[PDB]
Design a protein around this ligand. Structure first.
Ligand code: CHL
Ligand code: CLA
Ligand code: CLA
Ligand code: CLA
Ligand code: CLA
Ligand code: CLA
Ligand code: CLA
Ligand code: XAT
Ligand code: Q6L
Ligand code: Q6L
Ligand code: BCR
Lengths: 200, 227, 87, 96
């Protein structure tokens, strides 16, 4: 259901853009799960540490990646020994791209499917293996599907936000949010347009 | 059939709690009201009757906690008479008032008055119709009872109120008795902790909920200690 | 101590994790545990405690809540009091 | 049948190695109770070295080697006994 605006892929069509390829539905949902994780990560990283997500791109560089050690709120220990440099960027990126590429190739059937029970390639939400808690079978899986997709679109809008705010304010989404909640009259996009977004 | 009432019911509890008993919501997590294996003071009739007596006594008790304090604070009753519940002569070390007689004389008076009331009530509980038979100074006519020890429709119902919907009213009183038992539990509890009377604890929570609640009161668990 | 402090967050995380675990069958619960089970890897539904009274669609009970909260408080005590010992 | 089984021991090399080394390694791990975060195996080996210099002379009655020996051998033998029990029970139908 979409009383707010638009509709879901199963029924109806967007007047703003024709449906086109089907696989856009699959593409949209995965994009949204990713933006959910990205926005939440931006939110929580800048909540605990304070640094914006976009600046946090340089959180690890081939010369400087041991900086990340113990950069987590309340973390029991640092990620790696402090000042060792053993948490090199080369290592952490290699491990990352290995685990991601394996997950994505198993997702899309590039390589194989290690699990032998269904798990059809090309589905948003199989739920054989990727539902350990049984909340889909518990009920309202379809309601949860609409809920999922709406959270997807909201989070992609939020991520497009966080990108835009970075491009204009250069301050970070939570810092912008705190500034807006403190004095909403004089902390908005248009007063930043009046200052000229820095570039003007 | 509501939240916080399915918590207690189970196969055992629902086996005997049919629902016709006043304010029966099935909440019997323990096997206390099981008719089979019943005996002594853990038989279902005694428990139901004792719940009702406790509820009525708690309603009277909470009303006597709130009324003297509120009425003194506003000024309806004298300030010397508008003492908090636990400083009105219940505990002389905590506090006492100079009544007409000595606080222990009053204790003995109220003791035998409660003896003569409660033993009659008990004999109605055990032998229902027997309380209207023996010549109790010509007052047995209005103390016959009703066959239900919980609800004697004699003198005590002299207004004849709550007759059009007696079942609904029966439930009203059980629920109010439960609420008043919890209320009196609380009033004692935050009289032991806070050291003030229940109305003052109330208004303190109304004004500053985040500075006059339980967790803050842990630091000040005696207020001013009178011992 | 305050809301958001390390001890408060430890105990809140512990109770959330424990209650979720025994709500979704990851920890032994009132309605599903190792009583009359087969091996270490599989718990079984307890017919004696089956339908003991709940309004939660997985059958989560008040005793489940009390048990999870007690165990969570126990674990939070153990973890927090580590580092408070004098030595 | 009712005849005694001469393979009652069921001595498994993998059990022997697993128990020995899976006690040695944890007992060789850092222990902040001991000085310099030394392990139980570390301090025990230190006492063995110190007493092996005087090979005929035994360790003094007050020397810490005895407590380290007891507190290491208990854990070792616990690993040996429980490892045999668990392996032979898993092989059998005790667990699954
Ligand atoms: C006693 C342990 C402990 C405590 C009290 C906290 C406490 C907190 N953490 Mg931390 N964390 C802890 C361990 C760990 N955290 C992290 C990683 C994170 C992340 C990723 C996040 C937190 C968040 C939060 C929150 C709160 C301040 C969240 C936060 O930023 O909220 C403000 C959050 O997103 N913590 C790791 C993995 C390295 C830990 C390992 O044990
Ligand atoms: C200290 C050593 C130790 C202990 C406690 C355990 C414990 C366990 N193993 Mg074993 N195991 C060990 C070493 C040990 N393992 C080693 C070295 C190997 C390799 C040879 C194995 C191989 C093995 C297999 C193959 C299997 C097990 C399994 C099990 C579990 C089932 C019950 C059992 O057999 O033990 C009884 C254990 C208890 C904890 C019960 C209570 C005992 C009380 C508390 C007294 C114990 C005192 C304690 C050990 C302290 C010792 C110090 C001493 C000074 C007193 C249990 C968690 C089985 C399982 O299901 O695991 C998944 C299984 O299939 N184990
Ligand atoms: C890259 C992300 C992405 C993708 C792949 C899609 C894909 C889709 N969306 Mg989603 N959507 C997105 C972002 C995206 N949308 C965002 C951020 C919003 C929030 C404003 C929405 C809001 C939205 C609504 C309200 C509706 C859709 C609909 C659709 C379908 C329309 C077909 C189409 O032309 O889209 C292909 C993708 C693009 C053209 C990319 C958008 C680029 C713009 C034009 C710049 C398709 C499944 C409609 C639907 O479900 O169809 C029935 C529908 O009703 N979406
Ligand atoms: C918050 C929005 C949201 C919602 C409503 C859903 C809803 C759904 N998803 Mg989607 N999903 C989301 C976000 C969401 N998902 C994101 C961000 C990802 C990427 C990680 C996925 C990845 C994903 C996959 C791969 C699959 C699903 C599936 C499902 C369905 C069953 C699981 C369920 O009930 O989710 C309920 C969602 C919530 C209750 C949201 C709250 C999330 C909390 C705050 C996070 C807690 C995490 C923590 C580890 C909990 C531990 C508890 C224990 C102690 C349901 C349609 C499965 C399915 O439909 O199979 C048939 C399936 O295969 N989803
Ligand atoms: C070994 C000790 C012991 C044990 C195991 C029992 C067990 C039992 N008693 Mg007995 N009883 C005991 C001691 C014991 N009692 C003593 C010392 C007295 C004298 C006060 C009684 C007087 C007594 C009566 C009059 C009745 C029972 C009943 C019962 C049964 C129901 C229990 C129940 O619902 O109450 C659970 C407990 C409560 C509801 C709490 C009541 C509040 C008390 C006062 C709390 C006291 C706590 C305190 C630390 C102890 C002080 C004791 C002093 C000596 C059960 C068979 C009843 C029965 O048979 O019905 C089936 C019944 O009618 N018992
Ligand atoms: C995961 C986080 C964490 C951390 C870092 C610690 C760290 C510590 N705990 Mg805590 N603890 C935790 C979680 C944690 N605990 C949890 C989840 C629990 C459960 C609630 C506990 C419960 C607990 C207790 C009850 C105690 C500690 C103690 C200790 C200290 C270790 C002393 C020790 O083992 O000496 C080595 C000691 C021995 C090997 C002797 C063992 C016991 C002997 C043999 C007698 C046993 C009797 C009998 C034979 C046993 C039957 C089997 C240390 C500061 C102790 C402490 O603080 O002391 C000051 C203490 O008393 N912990
Ligand atoms: C190669 C093996 C060996 C040999 C030849 C000896 C020989 C001797 N020991 Mg040693 N001893 C050994 C193993 C050995 N012991 C082991 C394994 C232990 C540990 C249990 C001890 C513990 C020990 C003590 C505690 C003492 C001896 C003493 C002695 C002497 C009596 C004699 C020279 C005694 C000594 O010093 O002689 C006066 C003495 O007090 N031994
Ligand atoms: C809270 C209470 C009883 C609580 C019982 C509970 C929760 C029982 C719960 C369970 O059983 C169920 C439901 C279901 C079971 O399966 C499970 C359990 C869990 C076992 C009674 C209070 C009972 C409270 C009572 C009786 C209050 C009495 C007050 C009186 C008499 C008067 C006092 C005064 O006269 C003085 C002393 C001095 C004067 O100045 C002032 C006044 C206040 C006027
Ligand atoms: C966690 C975190 C912390 C670190 O510190 C830094 C870090 C970088 C690592 C970071 C991680 C980041 C990650 C993983 C991000 C993932 C992002 C993703 C996948 C975003 C998706 C963005 C999606 C967009 C734009 C879509 C726009 C589409 C639009 C408007 C049109 C929509 C639309 C449609 C089709 C039909 C309607 O009817 C009408 C209209 C036309 C409106
Ligand atoms: C699959 C599965 C199977 C099991 O059986 C059961 C199961 C439950 C575990 C289940 C698993 C589920 C999972 C893993 C769910 C993950 C959920 C997640 C990570 C949700 C995050 C949702 C986040 C959103 C929408 C963000 C909104 C963002 C907004 C408004 C921004 C606002 C904003 C802007 C842009 C500008 C300001 O300056 C700053 C701020 C930031 C304030
Ligand atoms: C989701 C949901 C919800 C929510 C839920 C929740 C949130 C719950 C919670 C719950 C909880 C949160 C609970 C808790 C509990 C607790 C407990 C039960 C505790 C205990 C404790 C103890 C027992 C202790 C002991 C001790 C002491 C005293 C001292 C010493 C030490 C120790 C620790 C041992 C609702 C309903 C809205 C709706 C539905 C869904």
């Amino acid at each position: 259901i979409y009383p707010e605006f638009g509709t879901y892929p199963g029924g109806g069509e967007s007047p703003i853009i024709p449906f086109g390829s089907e696989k856009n539905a699959e593409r949209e949902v995965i994009h949204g799960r990713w933006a959910m994780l990205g926005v939440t990560g931006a939110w929580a990283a800048e909540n605990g540490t304070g640094i914006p997500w976009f600046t946090a791109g340089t959180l690890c560089t081939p010369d400087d990646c041991t900086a990340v050690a113990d950069k987590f709120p309340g973390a029991v220990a640092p990620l790696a020994p402090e000042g060792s440099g053993y948490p090199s960027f080369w290592n952490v990126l290699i491990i990352e791209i290995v685990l991601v590429g394996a997950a994505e190739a198993y997702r899309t059937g590039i390589s194989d499917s290690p699990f032998d029970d269904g798990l059809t390639v090309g589905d948003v939400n199989p739920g054989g293996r990727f539902d350990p808690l049984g909340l889909a079978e518990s009920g309202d899986l379809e309601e949860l599907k609409i809920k999922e997709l709406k959270h997807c679109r909201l989070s992609m809008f939020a991520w497009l936000g966080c990108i835009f705010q970075a491009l204009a304010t250069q301050e970070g989404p939570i810092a912008n949010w705190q500034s807006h909640v403190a004095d909403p009259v004089h902390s908005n996009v248009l007063t930043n347009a009046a200052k000229g977004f820095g570039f003007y | 059939l509501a939240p916080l009432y399915v918590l207690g019911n189970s196969e055992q509890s629902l086996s005997y709690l049919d629902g016709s008993l006043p304010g029966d919501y099935g909440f019997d997590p323990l096997g206390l009201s099981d008719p089979e294996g019943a005996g002594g003071f853990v038989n279902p009739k005694w428990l139901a009757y004792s719940e009702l007596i406790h509820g009525r006594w708690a309603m009277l008790g909470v009303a006597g906690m709130v009324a003297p304090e509120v009425l003194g604070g506003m000024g309806i009753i004298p300030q010397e008479t508008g003492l908090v519940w636990f400083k009105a002569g219940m505990i002389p070390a905590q506090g006492t008032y100079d009544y007409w007689a000595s606080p222990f004389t009053i204790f003995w008076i109220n003791a035998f008055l409660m003896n003569i009331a409660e033993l009659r009530r008990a004999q109605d509980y055990w032998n229902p119709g027997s309380m209207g038979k023996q010549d109790f100074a010509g007052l047995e006519k209005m103390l016959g009872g009703s066959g239900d020890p919980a609800y004697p429709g004699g003198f005590f119902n002299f207004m004849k109120q709550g007759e059009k919907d007696m079942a609904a009213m029966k439930t009203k009183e059980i629920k109010n008795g439960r609420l008043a038992m919890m209320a009196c539990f609380g009033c004692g509890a935050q009289a032991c902790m806070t050291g003030e009377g229940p109305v003052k604890n109330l208004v303190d929570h109304v004004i500053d909920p985040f500075g006059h609640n339980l967790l803050v009161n842990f630091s000040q668990i005696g207020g001013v200690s009178p011992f | 101590w305050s809301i958001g402090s390390t001890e408060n967050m430890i105990v809140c995380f512990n109770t959330t994790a424990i209650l979720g675990a025994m709500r979704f069958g990851l920890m032994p619960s009132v309605k599903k545990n190792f009583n009359g089970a087969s091996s270490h890897t599989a718990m079984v539904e307890q017919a004696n405690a089956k339908t003991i009274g709940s309004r939660d669609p997985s059958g989560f009970t008040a005793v489940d809540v009390l048990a999870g909260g007690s165990l969570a408080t126990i674990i939070s005590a153990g973890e927090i009091l580590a580092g408070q010992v004098p030595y | 049948d009712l005849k005694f089984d001469d393979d009652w021991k069921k001595s498994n090399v993998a059990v022997h190695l697993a128990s020995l080394f899976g006690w040695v390694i944890p007992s060789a791990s850092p222990c902040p109770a001991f000085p310099d975060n030394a392990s139980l195996f570390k301090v025990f080996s230190d006492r063995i070295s110190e007493n092996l210099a005087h090979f005929p002379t035994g360790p003094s009655a007050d020397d810490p080697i005895w407590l380290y020996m007891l507190t290491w051998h208990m854990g070792l033998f616990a690993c040996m006994m429980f490892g045999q029990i668990g392996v032979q029970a898993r092989k059998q139908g005790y667990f699954g």
